[PDB]
Amino acid sequence: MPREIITLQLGQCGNQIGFEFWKQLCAEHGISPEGIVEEFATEGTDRKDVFFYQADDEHYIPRAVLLDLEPRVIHSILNSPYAKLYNPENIYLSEHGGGAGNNWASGFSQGEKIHEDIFDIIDREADGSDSLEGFVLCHSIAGGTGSGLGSYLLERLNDRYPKKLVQTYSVFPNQDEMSDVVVQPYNSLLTLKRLTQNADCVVVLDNTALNRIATDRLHIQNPSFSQINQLVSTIMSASTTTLRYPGYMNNDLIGLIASLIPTPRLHFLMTGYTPLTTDQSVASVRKTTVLDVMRRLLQPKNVMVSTGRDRQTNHCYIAILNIIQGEVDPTQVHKSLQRIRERKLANFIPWGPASIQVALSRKSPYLPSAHRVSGLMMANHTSISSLFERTCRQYDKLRKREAFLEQFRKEDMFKDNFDEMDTSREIVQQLIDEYHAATRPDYISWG
Amino acid sequence: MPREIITLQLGQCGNQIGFEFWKQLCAEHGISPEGIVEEFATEGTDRKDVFFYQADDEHYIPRAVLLDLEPRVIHSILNSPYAKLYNPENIYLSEHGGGAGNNWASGFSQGEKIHEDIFDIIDREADGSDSLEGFVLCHSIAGGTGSGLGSYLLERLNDRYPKKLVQTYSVFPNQDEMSDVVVQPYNSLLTLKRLTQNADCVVVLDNTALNRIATDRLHIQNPSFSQINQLVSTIMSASTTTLRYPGYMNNDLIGLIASLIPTPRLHFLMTGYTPLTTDQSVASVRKTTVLDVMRRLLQPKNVMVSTGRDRQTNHCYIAILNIIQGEVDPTQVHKSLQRIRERKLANFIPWGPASIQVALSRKSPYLPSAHRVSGLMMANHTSISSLFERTCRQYDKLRKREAFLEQFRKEDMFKDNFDEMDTSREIVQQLIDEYHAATRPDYISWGT
Amino acid sequence: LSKALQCSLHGDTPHASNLSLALKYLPEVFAPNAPDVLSCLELRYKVDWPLNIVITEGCLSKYS
Amino acid sequence: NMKDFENQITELKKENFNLKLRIYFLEERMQQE
Amino acid sequence: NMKDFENQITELKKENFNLKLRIYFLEERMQQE
Structure with missing residues (x-):
């Protein structure tokens, strides 16, 4: 089963992602x-x-x-195509409608x-x-409502299912885009804190990468939070099709992620998709080969993680698994592996056996697929640490600068200081360092 | 036969519920x-x-x-469409028309x-x-007249057909809402007392649960008192269906309740129905699945008894019979049982044999079914004790405060004391305790 | 089998009904950490005439 | 296999019961003549 | 499993055979009388 x-x-971005996800699933x-x-x-x-x-x-x-914590997102959901899809008794909207003021602590208190x-x-x-395995909370870490409410939802899922795994898709603030949520680094830190304490695995989703992909690949000059959330929901749908369309492989989330999460602490996952196409370019079904797919996967425009240019650490993939759905020729897969090796398109850990796992998934029969073959990659790559390290650095910079803290100071958790945000940033920094270590042979002795 | x-x-509310029940049965x-x-x-x-x-x-x-005890309700019955349904010799109207004054004891004295x-x-x-199998008394426990007169009617039904079984559908008052009828908790206690002593199985109909079913299942934002009475009549119909729809098994009321009532004291039953729809909500034929039916019947929001969510006590059904009519897929039944077990949506008695009996019958051509496939469950469930225990506690709280007792003191039954209210509260407490025991293996020794 | 078919979207299909779980042999004890522990289970496919000329018992045995 | 064995057992049980019924009625008739 | 179903089928087939032989002899006796 x-x-x-x-x-x-949670919040505007989380509710937009949910609405677009439900539209795509429908x-x-x-x-x-x-x-x-x-x-x-x-x-x-x-x-x-x-x-x-x-x-x-x-x-x-x-x-x-x-x-x-903000009524705006609930109203946007009720104005979305998915307004009638969800059970109205399963929708919690804060009565005060005042939102969290871009304060993670206010959102958390409203969730409480x-x-x-x-x-x-x-x-x-x-x-x-x-x-039911457990709960997956989709939210943004940069706002007030989506961050605080996301942490609250994660806490309540941990409380109700303490023996079940809790994975989160936590959108970290864009580091290349100017966030309108000036308190975004504090909110992101609080969300990373909750993922560290109450989630068992946190897949870091850098909004910077979503914006970069929208600009370079989707030709979206200014990705909105709603548009970024809808892109994230589309990526999640494509990666989850094998869970939603059962087949020979990847029929469960745990089967997909098992290859990706080597240690309980090294639980920061990066995602990849191939072939990458813009929403407007659905018209031309390109006969993309597995070699062509793998070549496109190496393009940063298709990577769902915005890693900083670390000049000191040679961040690398420990292992990469591509789950490909659609018409796939095994000879094309073989040529793809050959081309990747010749081009050294994937670096693996040197201390143990690692390979590209291949899961085949059926497409939805009711939805015409513009791509003959599509694929999600789950990979452990030390560059995923750069997203977590960047989120931590932004959190520390905001807490050290007390930036936008007056909005956070309205909530008791953030009223006097952002020390919880700074400790969260330190924990996320340690997670980044461990993820970079996981590219190295000494990861065996981590912890 | x-x-x-x-x-x-009994009383205005009870008489309205009875009239709507007789209309639905007709x-x-x-x-x-x-x-x-x-x-x-x-x-x-x-x-x-x-x-x-x-x-x-x-x-x-x-x-x-x-x-x-008030002539308004009797006159409304004789002015209702059911005026020719009732035997005119079977209509008793108090000459004084004064009612019970929202006093359970006054209603009991009027019944006397x-x-x-x-x-x-x-x-x-x-x-x-x-x-004749027996008598079913339909009344409300929240007023003064309908509760006391309903208990009186139950006593007289036991007296008149003492060798015949008497099952009742007794609507108990909501104990968590502040009743404007200050003596309602006493009335609720008296109704639970009469159900415990003279009924063999009592399906508790909580007007709070009726409103909850209307809101969550019937999509009725504000259930009217008429809608609550119609929900109570629907609950009575569901509890009496095995008497009213003959089949291979459970063709009589005593046979129907025999499987449901292990001990005379453990006679507090909770009910659930699915799909629940308001008369106005006929428009949307919900494609209810067997899994959805079983879940809603086991769901307190769609159940015609308002049991609190006790997280500590594993309240359970003593017995449940679901009569399902229509297109049913065996794989859907299997998935429904699987989902119910995984979600533990129904706890069954551990102390005795119980099952869901199924009789296949054609549907009435005269009754429009809002569901392509529908099913009624009649069940004896320990969660009804939570209604009865709460009613008993509220009764004791009112009696200790002599609340609304001045209206009862006008009637001879309560002129000197309110001992009938305290005895009703004690009987309802014993009924709650016995119903809770019926969820446990020790129910064999319940009431010892 | 009933639980797996009930949980499968295709488990109730008439094609799934042609599956039968048979035992090749009865082990006394499940050997721990043996990869072949469940090799005693066989899924058989029934072929009617004339398909059993083409879908031979050897073919069904290889499938099993 | 297993479903085919189940069908064979069920059919054989039905045939044996029908033959037993026919025998029973034959014996009752031979006892009546 | 499969051998147990085969054994049940074999016993039922033996009973069916014996019933058919007894029926055959019964019909021949009723045809001779």
């Missing part, structure tokens, strides 16, 4: 914006129960618990006020899950 | 509001004699007795004053019934 994931949507499964399967959606081969619950035999409701409702929503979504 | 059910209608049996068999009721598989009695060779009269009429009604319905 699939490993079901409960989705927690389109792939032929589910109407109300959660009902379209008459053309006759391929009952998709696993809705991993991410969605059935409200009726026809109506699919996401196994999602929506927790936010809605803790009971949020955990009831999460439990309701789990009961709609045939084999 | 069918197992006939005598309906006891619609299911294809009986017109005038007592004429409808032309659409061609499926002669329904037991009309379960809910209606023959008054003469041609007229089928609902076995309903309208009892009130109207005892003769009520027992005459029960005897007339029994003599018109070839194989």
Whole structure:
């Protein structure tokens, strides 16, 4: 059975990501914006129960618990195509509508006020899950609502499922884009703190990489938080298709991530997708070969992590696994491995056996795929530390500069100082250093 | 012969609930509001004699007795579409019209004053019934008249058909909401007392649970009092379905409750229905799955009994029977059982044999079903004790405060003391404790 | 088998109904850390005439 | 295999029961004549 | 498993055979009387 994931949507960015994810999932499964399967959606081969619950035999409701400290995101969800997809009893919106003021602490306190409702929503979504593994919270770490509410949701998932794994997709603030959330580094630090203490694995999603990909590959000059969240949701959908469309391989999230998470502390994951295409370029189904796919994967425009140019550390991939979905020729896979080796397209750890695992997944039959073959890569790469190290450096710079702390000072957790943010930044720095160490043979003795 | 059910209608709220119950039963049996068999009721598989009695060779009269201490409700019944359903000799109206003053004891004293009429009604319905199983009393526990008069009617039903089984659908008052009827907790205690002593199985209908079902399942934002009464009537219908819809098994009320009631004291039952829809919400035919049905029936938000979420006590069903009609996939049934077990949506009694009995019957052509596939569950569930224990605690809190006792002191039953309220609270507490025991293996020794 | 089919989207399909779990042999004890521990399980596919001329018992045995 | 063995066992049990019923009625008839 | 189903089938087939032989002899006796 699939490993079901409960989705927690926090703040503006998290709610936008959830809305776009639900739209994409509905389109792939032929589910109407109300959660009902379209008459053309006759391929009952998709696993809705991993991410969605059935409200009726026809109506699919996401196994999602929506927790936010700002009413704007809840209103945007209710104005989204997925407004009727989710169970309204599983949506928690802060009554004060005042948001978190871009303060992680305010968002966390609002989540704490809605803790009971949020955990009831999460439990309701789990009961709609045939084999709920745990909860996955999708939020941004840069805002006030999405950061604080995301940490609160993670805490409540940890409280309710303390023996179950809790993975988070935590969007770290863009370091190349000027964040409108001046307190974004403090919020990001608090979210990284919660991922360190209450999550078992944190996949670092650098909003800088999302903006860079939108600019260079999607030709989006200014990716909005909603647009960045929708890009993240599209990437998550493509990577999760093998969980939602069961096949011979990658039928569960844990099977996909097992190769990616070598140690409990080295749990910072990077993501990759190939072939990378802009949303506008869907028209031309390029007969991309596995060699061409692998060549495109090496392009930074397709990497979901914005690693800084570290000049001192030769950050490297310890291992890379590409899960490819669609029409794939094994001879093309062989040529891809050959071309990667000749071009040295992937560096592996030198201290143990590592390879490119290949998972084959079916495409949604109801959603026309513009690509004959698509693929998600999960890889352990020391450059993923650069995203976490960059988030930590920004957090430390904001706390040391008391930047935007007056908005945080309204909440008791951040009223006097941002020391929790600085300690979180230090923990994330240690995580980055461990991720860089994981490229080295001495990772065996880490901890 | 069918197992006939005598309906006891007590007070304004109880009489409204009884009238709506008789209307629903008539619609299911294809009986017109005038007592004429409808032309659409061609499926002669329904037991009309379960809910209606023959008054003469041609007229089928609902076995309903309208009892009130205030003339308004009795006059409204005689002015209702069910005026020809009830035997006019089975309608008792207090000449004083003053009601019970929201006092349970006053309602009980009025029932004692109207005892003769009520027992005459029960005897007339029994003599018109070839194989009368017993009487079902429909009333509200929150008012003054409907609770006390309902208990009086239950006592008289036991007295008149003492060798016949008497199952009741007793709507208990909400104990977590502040009732404007300050004596409601005493009334709730009296109703639970009468259900414990004179009923063999009591399905507790919490108006809070009715409102919750209307909100979450029927999408009714503000359930009206009429909607609460219709939910109570639906609960009574679901609890009496095995008496009203004959099949291979459970063809009589005593047979139906026999499987549900392990001990005479452990007679506090909770009910659940799925899909629950308000009469107004017929528009959206929800494709309810067996998994969705079982989950909503086991869900307190859709269950016609408002049990609190106790996290510490594993409240359980003593027995549950789901009669499912329509297209059912065996793989969907299997997935439903799997999901229920994984989510532990239903706890069953550990101390005795219990199962879901299934009888296959055709549907009534006269009753429109809002669901392509529907199912009723009748269950004895220990979570009903949480309603009964709360009602008992509220009763004790009111009696210790003498709250609203001045209205009861006008009636002879409460003129000198309020001992009847305290005895009702004690009986409801013992019923709650026995119902909780029925979730445990030690239920064999419950009440020892 | 019933739990796996109920959890499978394709487990209730008529094609899944042609699967049967049979035992090649009954081990006394499950050997710890043996990769071949579950080799006693066989999935058999039934071929009717004339398909059993083409889908031979040898073919079904190799599939098993 | 297993489903085919189940079907063979079920059919053989049905045939044996039907033959036993036929024998029973034959014996009752021979006992009546 | 498979051998146990085969054994049950074999016992049921023996019973069916004996029933058919007894029926055959019964019919021949009823045809001779």
